[PDB]
Amino acid sequence: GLYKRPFNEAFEETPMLVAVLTYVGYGVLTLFGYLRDFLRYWRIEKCHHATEREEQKDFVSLYQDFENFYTRNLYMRIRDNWNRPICSVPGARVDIMERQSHDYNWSFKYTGNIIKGVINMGSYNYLGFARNTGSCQEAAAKVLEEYGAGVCSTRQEIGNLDKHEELEELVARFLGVEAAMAYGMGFATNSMNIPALVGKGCLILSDELNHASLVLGARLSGATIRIFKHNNMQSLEKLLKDAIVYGQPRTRRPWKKILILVEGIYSMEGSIVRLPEVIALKKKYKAYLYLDEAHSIGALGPTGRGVVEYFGLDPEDVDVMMGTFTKSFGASGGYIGGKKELIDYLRTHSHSAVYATSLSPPVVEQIITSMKCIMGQDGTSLGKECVQQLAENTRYFRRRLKEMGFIIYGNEDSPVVPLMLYMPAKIGAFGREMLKRNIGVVVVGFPATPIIESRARFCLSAAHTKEILDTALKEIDEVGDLLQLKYSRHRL
Amino acid sequence: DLTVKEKEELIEEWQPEPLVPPVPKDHPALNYNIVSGPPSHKTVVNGKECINFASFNFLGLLDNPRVKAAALASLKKYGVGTCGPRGFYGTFDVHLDLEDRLAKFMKTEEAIIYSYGFATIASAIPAYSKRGDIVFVDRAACFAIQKGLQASRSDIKLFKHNDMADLERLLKEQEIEDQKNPRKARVTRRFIVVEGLYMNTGTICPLPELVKLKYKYKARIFLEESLSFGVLGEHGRGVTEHYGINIDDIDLISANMENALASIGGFCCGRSFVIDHQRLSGQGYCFSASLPPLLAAAAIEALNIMEENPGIFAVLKEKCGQIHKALQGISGLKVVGESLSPAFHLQLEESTGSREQDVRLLQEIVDQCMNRSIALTQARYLEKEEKCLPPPSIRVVVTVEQTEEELERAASTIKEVAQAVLL
Amino acid sequence: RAWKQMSWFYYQYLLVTALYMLEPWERTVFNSMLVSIVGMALYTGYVFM
Numbered sequence: 017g018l019y020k021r022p023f024n025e026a027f028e029e030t031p032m033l034v035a036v037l038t039y040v041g042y043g044v045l046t047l048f049g050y051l052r053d054f055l056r057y058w059r060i061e062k063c064h065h066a067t068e069r070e071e072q073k074d075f076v077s078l079y080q081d082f083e084n085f086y087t088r089n090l091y092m093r094i095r096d097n098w099n100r101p102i103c104s105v106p107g108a109r110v111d112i113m114e115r116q117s118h119d120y121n122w123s124f125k126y127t128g129n130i131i132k133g134v135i136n137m138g139s140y141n142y143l144g145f146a147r148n149t150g151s152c153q154e155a156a157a158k159v160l161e162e163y164g165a166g167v168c169s170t171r172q173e174i175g176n177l178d179k180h181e182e183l184e185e186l187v188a189r190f191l192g193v194e195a196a197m198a199y200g201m202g203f204a205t206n207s208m209n210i211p212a213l214v215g216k217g218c219l220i221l222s223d224e225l226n227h228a229s230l231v232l233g234a235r236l237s238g239a240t241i242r243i244f245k246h247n248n249m250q251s252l253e254k255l256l257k258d259a260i261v262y263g264q265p266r267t268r269r270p271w272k273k274i275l276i277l278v279e280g281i282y283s284m285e286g287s288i289v290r291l292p293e294v295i296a297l298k299k300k301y302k303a304y305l306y307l308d309e310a311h312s313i314g315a316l317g318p319t320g321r322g323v324v325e326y327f328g329l330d331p332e333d334v335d336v337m338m339g340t341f342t343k344s345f346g347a348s349g350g351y352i353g354g355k356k357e358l359i360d361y362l363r364t365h366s367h368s369a370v371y372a373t374s375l376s377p378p379v380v381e382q383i384i385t386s387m388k389c390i391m392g393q394d395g396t397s398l399g400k401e402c403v404q405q406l407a408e409n410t411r412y413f414r415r416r417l418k419e420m421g422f423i424i425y426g427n428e429d430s431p432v433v434p435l436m437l438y439m440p441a442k443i444g445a446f447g448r449e450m451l452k453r454n455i456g457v458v459v460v461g462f463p464a465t466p467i468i469e470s471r472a473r474f475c476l477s478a479a480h481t482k483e484i485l486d487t488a489l490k491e492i493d494e495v496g497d498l499l500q501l502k503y504s505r506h507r508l
Numbered sequence: 509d510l511t512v513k514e515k516e517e518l519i520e521e522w523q524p525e526p527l528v529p530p531v532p533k534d535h536p537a538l539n540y541n542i543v544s545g546p547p548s549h550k551t552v553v554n555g556k557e558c559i560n561f562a563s564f565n566f567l568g569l570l571d572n573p574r575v576k577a578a579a580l581a582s583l584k585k586y587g588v589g590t591c592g593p594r595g596f597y598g599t600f601d602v603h604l605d606l607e608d609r610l611a612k613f614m615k616t617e618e619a620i621i622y623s624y625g626f627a628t629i630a631s632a633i634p635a636y637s638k639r640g641d642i643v644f645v646d647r648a649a650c651f652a653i654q655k656g657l658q659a660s661r662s663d664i665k666l667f668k669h670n671d672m673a674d675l676e677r678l679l680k681e682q683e684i685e686d687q688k689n690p691r692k693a694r695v696t697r698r699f700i701v702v703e704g705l706y707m708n709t710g711t712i713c714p715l716p717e718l719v720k721l722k723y724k725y726k727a728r729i730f731l732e733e734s735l736s737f738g739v740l741g742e743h744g745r746g747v748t749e750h751y752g753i754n755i756d757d758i759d760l761i762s763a764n765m766e767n768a769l770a771s772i773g774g775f776c777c778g779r780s781f782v783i784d785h786q787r788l789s790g791q792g793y794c795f796s797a798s799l800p801p802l803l804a805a806a807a808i809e810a811l812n813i814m815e816e817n818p819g820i821f822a823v824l825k826e827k828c829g830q831i832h833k834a835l836q837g838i839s840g841l842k843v844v845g846e847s848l849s850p851a852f853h854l855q856l857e858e859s860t861g862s863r864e865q866d867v868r869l870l871q872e873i874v875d876q877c878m879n880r881s882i883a884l885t886q887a888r889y890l891e892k893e894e895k896c897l898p899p900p901s902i903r904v905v906v907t908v909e910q911t912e913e914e915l916e917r918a919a920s921t922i923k924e925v926a927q928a929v930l931l
Numbered sequence: 932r933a934w935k936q937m938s939w940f941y942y943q944y945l946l947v948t949a950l951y952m953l954e955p956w957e958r959t960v961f962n963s964m965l966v967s968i969v970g971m972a973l974y975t976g977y978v979f980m
């Protein structure tokens with residue numbers, strides 16, 4: 017594969033001392049969790065956790081204790097950093113309902129105070145389409161008046177509406193493909209359409225850091241699943257070679273199909289897939305490509321068409337293009353784009369098309385209006401300006417953070433910015449200290465990230481102005497001084 | 509082993525199957541019915557004015573002005589999308605309000621909101637059932653239950669539809685393997701997965717006997733309420749209220765907010781000890797964006813309307829009884845379902861050997877009925893993927909909007925059309 | 932003053948040892964174990980070395 021523009025990603029290795037201290041902290045916290053379970057065993061301390069009812073105490077216990085050891089002892093201690101209720105439109109500034117816990121995050125009490133004007137780095141609205149005013153809101157209001165909220169049937173049944181066909185035509189024109197199909201949920205898009213494409217006797221080559229929906233879709237299909245290293249084209253090529261040469265494992269029969277599941281942007285890593293090399297490999301080894309383009313469909317591309325446009329490649333080379341409307345367009349749903357034969361087969365054989373309720377009409381209207389705004393049909397230059405502004409914000413934020421001294425993962429063009437915290441206590445400390453300073457951030461550990469590399473993800477937006485970014489950067493610098501989070505050796 | 513030249517020859521000569529197989533042009537599911545406007549009572553389907561007998565809108569809340577007003581208020585307050593999962597600032601106050609309202613409506617401790625109706629149960633089942641567990645599931649279970657059972661890697665023991673003797677035989681057998689190996693038994697979990705009102709058959713589960721078997725053989729009960737949530741019981745609380753069972757005897761109750769509430773989404777209710785697990789183990793909950801606030805407000809207003817007026821369930825019951833009685837006696841069709849079911853089936857009394865011939869006959873009836881101002885739909889299934897594939901049938905769905913004379917006319921029109929087609 | 936510097940040092944110790952995530956009595960338990968180990972080490976070190 018040939019790259020027209022330079023491809024600059026950096027994943028700095030964890031400092032040895034930092035990794036050692038992370039292991040020490042996790043170990044001591046696990047020992048104290050063991051002591052807590054022992055204390056709760058003889059009821060030395062009261063049990064805030066719920067218990068099985070007395071009538072059902074003689075059943076086999078619903079949960080194995082060790083299975084939730086993480087949830088009760090590790091996650092529960094810093095639980096206040098997640099599930100923060102918001103009482104405002106999730107724009108650049110969001111209103112957070114303040115809550116407090118007097119039993120160490122076991123139960124939360126909602127104080128009357130509302131934290132207003134929090135700089136929002138957690139929400140996904142890359143192009144700033146999360147608004148409660150504007151043309152998309154007015155169109156959604158009109159369609160909600162005409163159609164109501166929700167539909168009460170399936171697409172193959174009476175649940176197919178003219179709005180759905182209009183949306184699918186528009187999405188196909190947007191992507192550059194022959195046809196597209198829309199679904200009520202992106203997680204459902206994956207989990208319900210991957211099983212239709214492949215089955216037993218086929219092979220799925222899945223990236224190491226694929227989304228849970230992609231993994232579930234691969235598991236629901238009966239195909240063999242093999243994992244290659246994240247954006248490692250050498251690992252992927254070796255897997256392709258071996259798979260073609262040696263056939264199916266028990267009986268060395270040739271595979272029916274080989275499907276490569278990749279993502280346009282891996283949000284937790286902030287890396288952009290090496291799409292030119294993947295397309296070259298799939299052309300050489302006659303594989304099929306499933307590109308989950310949820311985090312890049314609006315975020316990447318000169319005109320916001322995704323990773324394919326970002327690389328200047330042909331949309332027709334990708335066999336299946338997943339996308340999600342949640343991240344950039346500001347409405348729920350998902351889509352699959354491809355050739356007309358593929359979309360016809362999916363309309364016939366998708367699990368969602370047969371058993372799941374269609375998209376909501378106001379939601380599809382908001383998607384339609386946002387998409388026409390992006391592709392210039394709104395008659396105003398607002399959709400373009402969003403794309404340049406998001407690009408500028410990404411470049412500015414990433415450069416400022418890197419020259420402050422933090423370790424930042426991913427490609428330099430990726431609007432998701434993961435900052436490495438590396439320690440379990442710092443996961444809670446960073447979220448609490450940043451909310452104390454009026455910035456809402458997202459922090460993640462095991463259920464989304466590997467062990468040592470726990471992180472804070474910043475989602476940049478075109479709604480973010482430079483004043484907002486400057487405020488956030490200043491508070492991040494202050495907190496990094498406070499929490500000693502500048503682990504980088506190269507720049508500071 | 510192999511030479512590099514041999515390996516490159518093998519790579520060169522390998523031709524994969526096409527990504528999608530060729531699809532017949534004469535496929536029934538290939539032609540969607542395009543509905544112009546809302547899918548409401550008195551809808552337009554395929555360019556024809558029709559009375560809706562297809563959409564699962566039991567309480568007529570799709571075009572209720574109060575529901576639309578609440579949804580518009582939430583839209584003006586929040587916009588359409590949530591822009592994140594429940595974990596990351598995707599939790600609005602409307603979501604907590606809806607969860608609280610559902611928990612108070614169902615008389616349970618807690619409820620959890622999924623943004624997709626399939627995903628709620630397809631993710632609730634795998635969360636509790638793991639490898640080595642034994643699940644006893646009714647064979648006539650919906651596809652979402654089947655995919656939830658497949659996502660978990662537990663043993664699956666299908667039992668015959670509403671047959672308590674079959675379930676009890678399976679339980680006694682499992683007791684025999686428990687006796688053979690005690691240590692694995694002490695860690696093996698048992699689940700009975702049933703549906704309060706089955707969509708594939710239109711029948712109601714024997715819940716009292718299920719509860720007795722649960723306590724005798726120590727198997728936790730998961731109960732799907734997609735059809736029965738807002739239709740059954742004096743206050744429309746499900747099959748538990750219909751049978752008088754205490755809701756504490758049911759370990760999990762899952763429904764979708766799409767049929768009676770007439771908005772996108774699903775929910776699972778139960779004791780907090782059970783529900784709190786899904787907030788970190790439910791894949792459709794953790795790894796998907798939360799429900800749009802306007803849909804949540806529509807569901808909340810639907811709950812308000814159901815609570816204020818519990819006579820809607822009585823009128824729904826009487827309309828279901830009327831249409832069920834009127835449809836009895838079709839020359840070539842048999843009514844499959846129960847009088848208290850809002851959605852039931854019209855299967856062929858004598859089926860030709862070929863299933864696609866039966867589908868073509870049913871579609872002939874459906875098309876001639878749409879030419880006569882009645883919107884009927886044929887129950888659609890994935891033939892290869894379904895475990896127990898139901899027979900082809902025409903689906904009859906009853907709504908409080910459909911008047912008595914409309915129900916009589918629909919029955920008479922179906923009778924005439926079916927007796928012409930099947931002659 | 933410099934006490935605030937020592938308080939920041941204690942805060943860093945909390946963050947590194949994950950004692951920030953623990954309740955005050957768990958912190959006291961850990962610190963008691965720490966000073967106990969320190970005392971035994973100092974005793975053995977002075978006795979022989």
Ligand SMILES: CCCCCCCCCCCCCCCC(=O)[C@@H](N)CO
Binds near residue numbers: 091098592797
């Ligand atoms: C010391 C203990 C550490 C605790 C860490 C717990 C972290 C909880 C994360 C839960 C939410 C994950 C959402 C994924 C995003 C996604 O899937 C989107 N594509 C959907 O919109």
